[PDB]
């Protein structure tokens, strides 16, 4: 049908508090941008813990994807950086709610008072996802939860939209965070750069983290980072 598209029912606005949170995060972390990756990996780890917990009581939990991993790949020619986990994933409703709406009050005070380090505060609380906007002009979240069809969440920070993924169920289960890198954040397309950061931020992750890398004549394959 053409109703959903004709009435733009796929477009949403961010909650005021979220807009404020995004600015705070982007303003206070301007000097420590690389931490966006640590945060995305941390979120992936959490999603992996959730499905792991679900599998405990639900025997069919891991059906869509038996592995529990975090895989990262740089697409230098597309100017894209991908962080994929085979965690619990998110349903269409969760994409809207979990990423578009938000201890909120105290955090706003704590962050402001911390600006006027905050790297640890972003981690303690769970709003590190937004640090991605420090290096990306657009952030895309493709997700597949056991109880819904694969969906795509996209945003340039001025609004966000969620749509059914026309590519179908390609993830099996999990989430891929896709960053359309800012022109100045081109270094995150470099394998070694990503490797140094990934290896430096996966040391405390109990799940295996891989980076799609090359070896030498030149062959590509997943390389374990932790
Ligand atoms: C304030 C930003 N919102 C989130 O990071 C929330 O969104 C969802 N989320 C973010 N990244 C992932 C992920 N990789 N897998 C599953 N849920 C996620 C979780 O519910 C998080 O608590």
């Amino acid at each position: 049908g053409s109703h959903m598209l004709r009435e733009k029912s796929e477009k949403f606005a961010f909650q005021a508090e979220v807009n404020r949170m995004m600015k705070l995060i982007i303003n206070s972390l301007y000097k420590n941008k690389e931490i966006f990756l640590r945060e995305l990996i941390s979120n992936a780890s959490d999603a992996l813990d959730k499905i792991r917990l679900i599998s405990l009581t639900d025997e069919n939990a891991l059906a869509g994807n038996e592995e529990l991993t975090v895989k990262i790949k740089c697409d230098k020619e597309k100017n894209l950086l991908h962080v994929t986990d085979t965690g619990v994933g998110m349903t269409r409703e969760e994409l809207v709610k979990n990423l578009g709406t938000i201890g909120t009050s105290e955090f706003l005070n704590k962050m402001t008072e911390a600006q006027e380090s905050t790297s640890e505060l972003i981690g303690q609380f769970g709003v590190g996802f937004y640090s991605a906007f420090l290096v990306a002009d657009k952030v895309i979240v493709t997700s597949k939860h056991n109880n819904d069809t694969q969906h795509i969440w996209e945003s340039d920070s001025n609004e966000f939209s969620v749509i059914a993924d026309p590519r179908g169920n390609t993830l099996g289960r999990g989430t891929t965070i896709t960053l359309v890198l800012k022109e100045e954040a081109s270094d995150y397309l470099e394998l070694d750069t990503i490797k140094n950061l990934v290896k430096k931020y996966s040391q405390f992750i109990n799940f295996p983290i891989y980076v799609w890398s090359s070896k030498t004549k030149t062959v590509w394959d997943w390389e374990l980072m932790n």
Side-chain angles (χ1 to χ4, degrees), residues 1-7 9-29 32-58 60-65 67-104 107 111-112 114 118-119 121-203 205-216 218-226:
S2 73
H3 83 85
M4 192 170 277
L5 197 50
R6 285 187 296 92
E7 66 193 14
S9 56
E10 300 169 306
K11 292 183 174 298
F12 305 79
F14 281 97
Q15 183 174 327
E17 288 71 6
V18 179
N19 284 324
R20 305 201 179 94
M21 191 176 281
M22 285 194 271
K23 292 176 177 176
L24 285 171
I25 293 171
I26 296 173
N27 299 331
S28 65
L29 271 36
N32 213 14
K33 290 191 181 72
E34 63 285 359
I35 66 83
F36 79 86
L37 186 53
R38 181 193 67 190
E39 294 310 305
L40 293 192
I41 285 175
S42 179
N43 290 336
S45 183
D46 291 350
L48 286 160
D49 282 329
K50 282 185 184 63
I51 192 61
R52 197 177 193 185
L53 285 172
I54 292 167
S55 74
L56 291 177
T57 47
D58 189 320
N60 295 295
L62 301 176
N65 205 319
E67 88 186 37
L68 294 177
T69 68
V70 183
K71 292 180 179 183
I72 301 177
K73 71 175 66 167
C74 302
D75 194 314
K76 188 166 62 176
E77 77 167 63
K78 258 71 178 184
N79 187 46
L80 301 184
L81 171 59
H82 300 289
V83 177
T84 305
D85 68 67
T86 52
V88 60
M90 287 181 273
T91 61
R92 74 190 73 191
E93 287 74 18
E94 295 183 310
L95 282 172
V96 177
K97 182 168 180 171
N98 299 25
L99 300 175
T101 71
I102 180 62
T104 305
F107 184 65
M111 278 294 279
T112 296
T118 59
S119 183
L121 205 54
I122 303 299
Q124 298 196 314
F125 201 49
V127 305
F129 170 72
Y130 301 123
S131 62
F133 282 118
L134 285 167
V135 308
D137 281 323
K138 293 199 68 179
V139 177
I140 303 112
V141 180
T142 303
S143 197
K144 178 66 182 64
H145 183 288
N146 277 355
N147 291 320
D148 203 351
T149 50
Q150 193 160 306
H151 273 73
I152 304 176
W153 176 102
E154 68 109 87
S155 174
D156 72 346
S157 85
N158 299 303
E159 69 174 313
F160 73 84
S161 63
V162 175
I163 62 174
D165 195 334
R167 297 166 302 184
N169 181 353
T170 67
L171 299 173
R173 182 199 65 258
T175 302
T176 286
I177 311 295
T178 294
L179 308 191
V180 177
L181 301 184
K182 292 182 178 301
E183 184 186 3
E184 54 274 47
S186 66
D187 203 29
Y188 296 111
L189 296 170
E190 294 304 308
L191 298 187
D192 289 315
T193 299
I194 293 300
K195 291 186 176 192
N196 283 315
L197 297 170
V198 174
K199 179 161 182 52
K200 172 190 175 181
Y201 297 156
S202 302
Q203 191 180 63
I205 303 308
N206 298 311
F207 298 104
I209 305 203
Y210 307 86
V211 172
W212 184 246
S213 57
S214 56
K215 281 187 165 175
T216 309
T218 293
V219 299
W220 296 78
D221 194 32
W222 300 108
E223 185 190 309
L224 179 63
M225 296 299 99
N226 73 350

